[PDB]
């Protein structure tokens, strides 16, 4: 899961995925580009696509992208889609095997980032698919703590409810 | 055909930020400083100095999020340049300079040298994304945003990196830091000994030859009493320490 697949053609695929160039990613993948091309930061085309490029997420998954690739800070594509609020990408990643409880090097899970960023439906979908509400980050904070510390009342209510059971 | 030496400070004398050295403070934000420094230089170069601004490291460091990495705990230059093309960046100068919308909030410190400022400490806490300008400043945060037209990686090629700096201005790069690099004062750096301390991002603004050794001219963000007034030279042409392997840049929106 820790890629560092690096090359000229890999730089092109990473750039096309981060620029939202759907047709250019299709051309590079139809001609042998490495779907998990990476670099010294462990970032892959699917991490770049998680930043709101659903059609590119679908193409890279069709070519076998590692859905749980972890970069040098321990973030996976699911952490980034949850942080940026892209509900449909979070749904597709989970339907393709994404680890709902992946923990970054500073202990941040996808649920911590959705509670911190104020993305309620994403928090609800991760919760329903198994996210650990008692996970502590580097600062001993749980997702409820971060929702509370960031003023996201609705998410804190949902998390408060889930601990009640 | 490229000259044997090139210094963006000499090629674009009317762009003051190319000469300036910043201080990231007790925060692992080199990824952010290399980006806003080179972006500041390119905004001036590509508007023929009609627009000269210090781009805010604070804005980039606090608002990008996990797409750019971990704030004061390390970050990712390619997504920093992407954020500038996406959301833009406001202006913002040095700590307590009151220059721009969001000047840097982390105080300067001594990096691997003795001096009158406090010693740098462990990576601090990342400051909050506060989308509001300093009270004394006008325009508003939204109107102060400067946007990039595009961003891109440069190939791991000495020649392509020189051509890109020559034509479009300073770029951001990263390299592996070994402990002998922390003691740099002058000369062309070449790793000889020391433990690996990690990858660090910087701004490359030129190249030359010194003592028979080809080199890249680089700006660090450890203030001016570190290195050679804040700058350093490192072996060029051999992807030394990975210096030619993670170069990124981009063109500003001339709007």
Swiss-Prot record, chain B:
Sites bearing N6-acetyllysine, chain numbering: 142
Q: Which residues are glycosylated?
A: 114
Cysteine-cysteine disulfides? 15-44, 27-72, 63-129, 64-68, 101-133, 109-120
Going by the entry's taxonomy, the superkingdom of the source organism is recorded as: Eukaryota
The catalytic residues are 30, 200, 220
* Protein name according to UniProt: Cathepsin B
Mapped onto the parent protein, the portion here is 79 to 333 of 339
